[PDB]
Design a protein around this motif. Structure first.
Motif: not given
Ligand SMILES: [Zn+2]
Ligand SMILES: [Zn+2]
Ligand SMILES: [Zn+2]
Ligand SMILES: [Zn+2]
Ligand SMILES: [Zn+2]
Ligand SMILES: [Zn+2]
Ligand SMILES: [Zn+2]
Ligand SMILES: [Zn+2]
Ligand SMILES: [Zn+2]
Ligand SMILES: [Zn+2]
Ligand SMILES: [Zn+2]
Ligand SMILES: [Zn+2]
Ligand SMILES: [Zn+2]
Lengths: 8, 211, 210
Positions: B206-208, B120, C121, B132, B130, C123, B115-118, B134, C127-128
């Protein structure tokens, strides 16, 4: 004996 | 004082294997040895006392044996919830712990759920960014994570933290964080996390896109 | 049921004093001696001694004679560990017990000040997309000392939570925590990470927004 075990 | 030599310091075994730990005392301790299980963040749990008596509620997979100076502790079939560091304790005269045995549980290969997270909004307003990733529930532990920004690898600013071995399924999980300045983060568009053991050739990607 | 509950983590300066409590229940307090055990970072368990809970008489291991004091409040079925003139080498987690054990009290001896964490957070943004389940997280950044506890939805989602151990850099700790819930629950329902940093008496609450 000698103070170990049995608690529970 | 009575010294206790615990062996091995580290033990690797597969799920379902029988594992045996030994402790030898510097003198006869006449069966006054206890065995403890310790998981990080928890207090020690007494498993066996007087060499071979199980505490209430302890699974029958655990046993102990010995006399004089030589003692052993065994798990009949290693299971995921057994992940812990194990210690013997003599209580013949005062108390002395052995040095401990860390367990490495072997199990089947598992690919991570990724899982990728942009960053905040809260962090961006403070000047940092950051990203992140997982990687949950993989095996073996030596996974590799690659970070790409706009399709090019980035290595600076990456911090990686592995969990202890999972008490449910004996996998590992790990968190990977790429930390940039906010200005750098907003100077690029695509952000990519890639995971490989190089067992599976094709990385889990995984990308965004910021846009 | 038998339970031993110790006081929370502590930050103290060299030369100061700490007093750790150990509240026992579920059994007859004065029937069993209370032992104290030290675990320094990355080391094994070391026995410190015991106190007779009927007479209050303590017995100390050789390495713990001088600056260490065991005591009792028997009416409150509580044991105490006091460490005077604190040293850097006292940084450790301390456990009380015998057959059953408290959860440990982490002590950090340092001149640095406490720093509460910032909580960000984690979330899926744009993308995902989705799946049968969705993974959320909280990044817990820049705090000192250890430890922190991340609670998700007051304890409802306690299952399927992964805790990633803190890393240290430039004197501050960063950790993170992940939870996985069915996609039909988030963002349909509220998900919150509550981050407690007991050494600074601080709780940081963050709602996970889509
Ligand atoms: Zn000796
Ligand atoms: Zn001695
Ligand atoms: Zn003897
Ligand atoms: Zn520990
Ligand atoms: Zn022998
Ligand atoms: Zn793999
Ligand atoms: Zn490998
Ligand atoms: Zn897990
Ligand atoms: Zn750039
Ligand atoms: Zn002071
Ligand atoms: Zn205190
Ligand atoms: Zn009684
Ligand atoms: Zn010192």
């Amino acid at each position: 004996g000698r103070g170990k075990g049995g608690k529970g | 004082d009575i010294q206790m030599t615990q062996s091995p310091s580290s033990l690797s075994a597969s799920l379902g294997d029988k594992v045996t730990i030994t402790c030898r005392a510097s003198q006869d301790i006449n069966n006054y040895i206890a065995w403890f299980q310790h998981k990080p963040g928890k207090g020690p749990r007494l498993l066996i006392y007087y060499t071979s008596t199980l505490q209430p509620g302890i699974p029958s997979r655990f046993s102990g044996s010995g006399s004089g100076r030589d003692y052993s502790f065994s798990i009949r079939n290693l299971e995921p919830e057994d992940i812990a560091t194990y210690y013997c304790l003599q209580y013949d005269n005062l108390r002395t712990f052995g040095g401990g045995t860390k367990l490495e549980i072997k199990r089947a290969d598992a690919a991570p759920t990724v899982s990728i997270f942009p960053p905040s909004s809260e962090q961006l307003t403070s000047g940092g960014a950051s990203v992140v990733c997982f990687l949950n529930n993989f095996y073996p532990k030596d996974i590799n994570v690659k970070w790409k920004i706009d399709g090019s690898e980035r290595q600076n600013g990456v911090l990686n933290s592995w969990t202890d071995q999972d008490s449910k399924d004996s996998t590992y999980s790990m968190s990977s964080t790429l930390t940039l300045t906010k200005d750098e983060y907003e100077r690029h568009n695509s952000y990519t996390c890639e995971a490989t053991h190089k067992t599976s050739t094709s990385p889990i990607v995984k990308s965004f896109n910021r846009n | 049921q038998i339970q031993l509950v110790q006081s929370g983590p502590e930050l103290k300066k060299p030369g100061e004093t700490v007093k750790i409590s150990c509240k026992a229940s579920g059994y007859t307090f004065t029937d069993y001696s209370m032992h104290w055990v030290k675990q320094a970072p990355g080391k094994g368990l070391k026995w410190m001694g015991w106190i007779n809970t009927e007479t209050g008489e303590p017995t100390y291991a050789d390495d713990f004679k001088g600056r260490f004091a065991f005591s009792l409040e028997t009416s409150a079925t509580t044991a105490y560990l006091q460490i005077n003139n604190l040293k850097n080498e006292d940084t450790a987690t301390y456990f009380c017990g015998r057959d059953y054990w408290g959860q440990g009290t982490t002590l950090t001896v340092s001149s640095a000040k406490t720093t509460p964490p910032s909580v960000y957070p984690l979330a899926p943004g744009c993308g995902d997309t989705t799946g049968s389940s969705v993974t959320l997280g909280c990044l817990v950044k820049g705090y000192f000392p250890e430890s922190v506890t991340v609670t998700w939805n007051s304890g409802s989602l306690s299952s399927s939570v992964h805790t990633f151990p803190a890393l240290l850099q430039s004197g501050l700790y960063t950790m993170s925590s992940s939870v996985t819930v069915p996609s039909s629950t988030w963002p349909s329902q509220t998900v919150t990470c509550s981050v407690a940093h007991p050494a600074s008496s601080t709780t940081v609450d963050k709602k996970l927004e889509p």
